[PDB]
Amino acid sequence: GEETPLVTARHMSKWEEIAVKEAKKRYPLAQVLFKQKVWDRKRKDEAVKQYHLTLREGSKEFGVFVTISFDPYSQKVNKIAILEEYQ
């Protein structure tokens, strides 16, 4: 199925799923049908790897961004938040 653009290219990230789980659950009128990466980095003693998915609601599709603050030491997720695109 066209579940993501990976016709031969399965290579998911650590948080590429935690992001999805929140990105369906916070969107009760909608469905999430994508998984794309963005920027990422680390700091001394935090790290960030957000993602961009595509939600679908009614007949609109729209992206949302999943804030995940984690730790570089052992991937303790320090916190999570959610952010909506608007147009």
Curated annotation (Swiss-Prot):
The keyword Signal applies. Keywords: Signal. It comes from the Bacteria. This is Uncharacterized protein YqzG. It comes from Bacillus subtilis (strain 168). The gene is yqzG. The chain holds residues 23 to 108 of 108 of the full protein.
